Alpha-galactosidase
Amino acid sequence: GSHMASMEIFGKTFREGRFVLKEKNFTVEFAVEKIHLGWKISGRVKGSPGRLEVLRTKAPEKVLVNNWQSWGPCRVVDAFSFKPPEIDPNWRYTASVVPDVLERNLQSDYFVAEEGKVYGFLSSKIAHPFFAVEDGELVAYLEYFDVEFDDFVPLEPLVVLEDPNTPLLLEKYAELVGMENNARVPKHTPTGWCSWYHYFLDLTWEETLKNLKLAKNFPFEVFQIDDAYEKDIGDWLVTRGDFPSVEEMAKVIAENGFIPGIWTAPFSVSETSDVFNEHPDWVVKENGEPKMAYRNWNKKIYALDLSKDEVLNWLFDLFSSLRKMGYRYFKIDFLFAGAVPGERKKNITPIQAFRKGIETIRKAVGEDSFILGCGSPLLPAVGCVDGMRIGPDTAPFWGEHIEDNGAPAARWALRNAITRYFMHDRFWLNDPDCLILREEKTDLTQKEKELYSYTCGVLDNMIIESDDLSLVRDHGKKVLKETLELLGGRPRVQNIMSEDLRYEIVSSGTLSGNVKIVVDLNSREYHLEKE
Ligand SMILES: OCC1=C[C@H](O)[C@H](O)[C@@H](O)[C@H]1O
Ligand SMILES: [Mg+2]
Ligand SMILES: [Mg+2]
Ligand SMILES: [Mg+2]
């Protein structure tokens, strides 16, 4: 095709074959090979590749772009009329791991799509793979963060797929990612309860116990304590308020017949924490001093340096201790912190460091524990997590005055469940964030609760409820029951390039047979048909 002859690969005219590029500072050896639905570019690199240009082609007008982490948008953008965002200096790295790009040009992490075409990297093991629109050209890069390689390391493979069925392409892409990374796709999806979206930081053990008793009347397997119990970020085995010990909490939850679950932010240590105050050289640095990874909880939060053996040992000991207590469901959050650019003890990439950290956690919790990632780089976590939050936080409100900028809102949480649907049952189980089904202490309507819940069910996504269970009555019980009956299928979002927040979603082979739901996030309406 005329468009394919127009591509450049490592600066050379596109064509099938086997090539060597010897530059001043680096060497690439790569192959361009035909695969089903398109092409694969793979090989190996050594030296100092820096920010390595892999592919160049003319930019499409409308592109599906993807943020690197859980909370960031996956959405269709007009590439021509793009203006750089103002990046919040307290959250710079959720917006981009290469913020020099985003402050100038449109950025997409891991993959980008247009009608009929997907460009997608199959892994992020060493480099960060991304796309930029640079003076009207789409450019694919592998970022090596100034790391030098004495011997060859593998490229992250790039595929270029074409077919009129864009959803089929994204599904194919994700199947290839799953194979490249030995994705975990559990045969069972947990149900359960989470404290966060009712109680927030104000959870008490008294209220937890009330819910633990009521949970016996609900179809919940896991009972997960969120952020509230811990005295500080990093001090995960020290509790506060009316909480008992972390070990005692697990025992109470297990005595009551649930799988105990717990939230941590394990790559994060606050400026006030015992662990940071004891171990000031355990963190990622800038000009030799602690580098803020983000600000949250009204504190500067630092990133653990996952290149250091002392740090990995501490993480192993923490998670193995939690396993010994009986926790078997782990929500591990703010994981981007582990992958911040900066100075580390070993001269490895932030992505290499990140992967050492999450692999340590998996080793510690064992094969029989469920790991839910959150706030996380997506591609580097494939093969390690069982489930992954794939959108910004939901909320007990639709979010009429909330922009698509990452503040909590049911409407934007649900958008990302739809636009990242194709990762589900291929990368991991997708977590669309919790259902909020209470009928007091909420501004959600019955129709909004139904729209969110039934969409998650058609998508076969994880179903976790987050409510004061005393405030969930006949409607909320009915909605959860019906939602669980929509699970089990193979979903497809038929019109993935939609720009008006209306989506047509089918799922084959659910517990309710073949189903279709049309959802309109702007009118807050749905139309569900079950065969
Ligand atoms: O601090 C608790 C918390 C923070 C993040 O915004 C998560 O996505 C949210 O679900 C909650 O665990
Ligand atoms: Mg005690
Ligand atoms: Mg989510
Ligand atoms: Mg499934």
